Amino acid sequence: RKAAGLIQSIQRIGSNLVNRAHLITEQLTSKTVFLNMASFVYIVFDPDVERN
Amino acid sequence: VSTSTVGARRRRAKQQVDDEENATLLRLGPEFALKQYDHDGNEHDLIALSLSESRLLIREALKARSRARNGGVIDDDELAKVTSGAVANGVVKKTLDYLNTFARFKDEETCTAVDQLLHNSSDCSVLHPFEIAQLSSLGCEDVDEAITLIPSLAAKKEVNLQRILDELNRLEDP
Amino acid sequence: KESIRRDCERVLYFQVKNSFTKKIDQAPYQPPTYAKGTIPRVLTLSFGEGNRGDAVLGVFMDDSGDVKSQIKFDEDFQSRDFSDSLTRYIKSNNINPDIIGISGFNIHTKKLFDKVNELVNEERLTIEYDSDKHLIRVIYVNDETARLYQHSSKSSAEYPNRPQLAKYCIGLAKYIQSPLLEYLALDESMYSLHI
């Protein structure tokens, strides 16, 4: 149930998650749930896209 | 498989409310009606049986069959094994266990006294045989308890229910 | 009796958990000269039951997970025509398999496996990255999940215009590409497997 809520929240915000911290700053997840799930979900980083 | 002695019952148009089975309303259906017919077509009453009467009858019939099959020469397990059919053996074993663990009267004379008390009584001359079987089987202790368990007895308030229950408890072996 | 029952149930629970862990712990097949975990390009073949009438159906899946160029062969697989058709199919410029998977319903699949392996070895059909050259690998594929996939309504909705054997080939290719997700796609049906 939490996965479907997370997917719907991401699709509301724009179907793209820029940063891991946005699971907390955008109120998408709670503190302990994020603390559990932070290192097991990842965002592919492309150096050509992020020069900064 | 087996067919009752009551036949006919062809198509009609009227529908009645006294058709559904219901213990509380004392509507036992046509095949279990108060009036029955034997093989000779004579009048016959519905024969209810309490667990004591049923246990006595099944024990008597089973021991008679066992004696007959053995050339006329007590254990429940061997007596059940006398019968044929594995499913039949299981069914008779289950009935023997159920009767044994809830036998209110294991003696012939006590059962005879109970039947005489529940039949020859003036108040019980109006009582339905199903009510008699339920009272002799369930082993109720209170008039209110009997009325709650048996709703039919509520409408028959001309019955000395309490003293009959106390006599049944007295006859019951502690 | 209750205590021993509970203890033995715990031990059997952990044994079943370890067996299932051994079942699902598989990486995707690693093509040679490529880093582990790279999704390979797969070609799968199966005639079905192996009877006289049954034809061979092929499905090619690229590394992006898109099914490409399902084909049907209209000749006896023990003939030279089938070998020529398969050689033309594999050597086509638009198809570049990394591995060839074969599975079937009975022992007739061994003849297909031997035929394809002999054809690959004799014709020297090498992997086309379009230096060192390596022949394409021919293996048997465990079809635990494909047989349930071919009957699933999700597969039928996904590919309405395709027969059951095409869905079986797609299931085999998907199993080669990602065993874990194929086990996950079974949903309630994965408790009925031989764990």
């Binding site: - | - | 598989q26 990486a27 582990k36 079937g104 009975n106 022992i107 061994k110 048997y140 465990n142």
Partner: protein, 207 residues
């Protein structure tokens, strides 16, 4: 994750046949569908389509000398005992000899240790099961003859008591349906029972 698992000979055999290498091995007995009969070899197909083979020394009994073609026919199914399994080529060798097909019954390695197995109870139960397999059916015999009466020996003697000397009665014999005992009155309260053996009987009840 671990590398992609590649099936071995046993896994390929189990995949393609659905018979494990435990339930299909040396010494087991299976029914096989005969397909070819020759002078020196026999080719059969098992239930899971594994092609079997039996040689001349394994088709016929040592005391037999008849040709193999006369003994078995194409399309017949027989019992055979496995002598070798080739798990890679899906081929097996079998034998139809009595010593292999029937004697090998205890195919499971049940730990029959005397301290860990109730040997005597098993023997008693097995003996009782053989004593129940010895049970047979039997019935009386009916014969149509004017001087035949379905009576015992003493019953025949009592029946002949009311009759004068020389009258003859016939009763079934206790030695079997193939025997008939004829009793005739030798003297007052003296009777002789003579057993008659029947040959070329059309039926048990027939004469």
């Amino acid at each position: 994750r671990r590398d992609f698992h590649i099936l071995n000979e046993a896994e390929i055999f189990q995949l393609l046949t659905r018979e494990t290498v435990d339930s299909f091995r040396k010494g087991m007995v299976i029914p096989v569908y005969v397909r070819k009969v020759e002078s020196s070899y026999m080719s059969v197909s098992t239930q899971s389509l594994i092609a079997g083979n039996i040689q001349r020394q394994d088709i016929l009994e040592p005391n037999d000398r008849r040709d193999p073609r006369e003994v078995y026919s194409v399309g017949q199914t027989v019992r055979a005992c496995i002598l070798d399994v080739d798990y890679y080529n899906f081929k097996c060798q079998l034998s139809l000899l009595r010593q292999f097909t029937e004697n090998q019954v205890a195919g499971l390695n049940v730990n029959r240790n005397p301290k860990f197995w109730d040997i005597e109870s098993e023997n008693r139960d097995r003996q009782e099961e053989i004593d129940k397999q010895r049970e047979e059916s039997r019935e009386s015999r009916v014969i149509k003859h004017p001087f035949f009466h379905n009576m015992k020996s003493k019953e025949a003697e009592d029946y002949l008591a009311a009759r004068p000397v020389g009258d003859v009665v016939i009763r079934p014999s206790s030695k079997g349906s193939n025997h008939i005992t004829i009793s005739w009155k030798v003297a007052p309260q003296l009777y002789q029972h003579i057993d008659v053996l029947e040959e070329n009987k059309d039926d048990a009840n027939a004469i």
